[PDB]
Assembly symmetry: C3
Homo-oligomer: 88 residues x 3
């Protein structure tokens, strides 16, 4: 009262699983060898994710919902940044 | 309870974020310039989504769950229609 | 609290809708003709899914959360097998 969101890309593939548990959203990564803890760590009770490739460059969008409000987080190769998404 | 589902397609990309809040599911859209409110509006407490391309034409399937029942909604270019999906 | 997750692949397309309801996760499938009940059946309150292709062969990963623990399930052509995923 655990909630997950998953995305994958490429043919290896790379997989990312985001878990919202105890008011925190964390990330677990698979790139073909084993699972490791990712850099994503934001407060939230709910999470959704989508991702796309531009050649070999991955872009991830994580929608983290905390206390009635939804924040979009972007991964575009170098660090997680807050996105332009708003609910209204 | 906010609960979201997201899908994306193409290289721009186009992103669709569906939010179930206060018994209603609404849609926000990104097509490369800015976020705008989509046409989708159906009752529901939970939402999932998947999409696929047929060349450049998008097909979206939204699964909206409301009061114990799941209804599929289809976007195939010209309007949201009710899908053939049943749970059993 | 019905909670769903969806994935699709190819041009037909094939669609898989996973539903967590009454402490069980079941699967409904569409391969171009009609909806039918799939072999996936595991205990759980929450579910997410991701899939990818290697040619026309589908690989599906289902993340089933039951009583605080998340188990990854793999479909790689011949049966559902437990995956290496751990939360930590
Ligand atoms: Zn707990
Ligand atoms: Zn909280
Ligand atoms: Zn509220
Ligand atoms: Zn309701
Ligand atoms: Zn249970």
């Amino acid at each position: 009262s655990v909630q997950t969101a998953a995305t994958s890309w490429g043919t290896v593939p790379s997989i990312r699983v985001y878990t919202a548990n105890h008011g925190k959203i964390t990330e677990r990564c698979w790139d073909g060898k084993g699972w490791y803890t990712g850099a994503f760590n934001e407060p939230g009770d709910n999470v959704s994710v989508t991702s796309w490739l531009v050649g070999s460059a991955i872009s991830i969008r994580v929608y983290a919902s905390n206390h009635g409000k939804t924040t979009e987080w972007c991964w575009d190769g170098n660090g997680w940044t807050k996105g332009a998404y708003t609910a209204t």
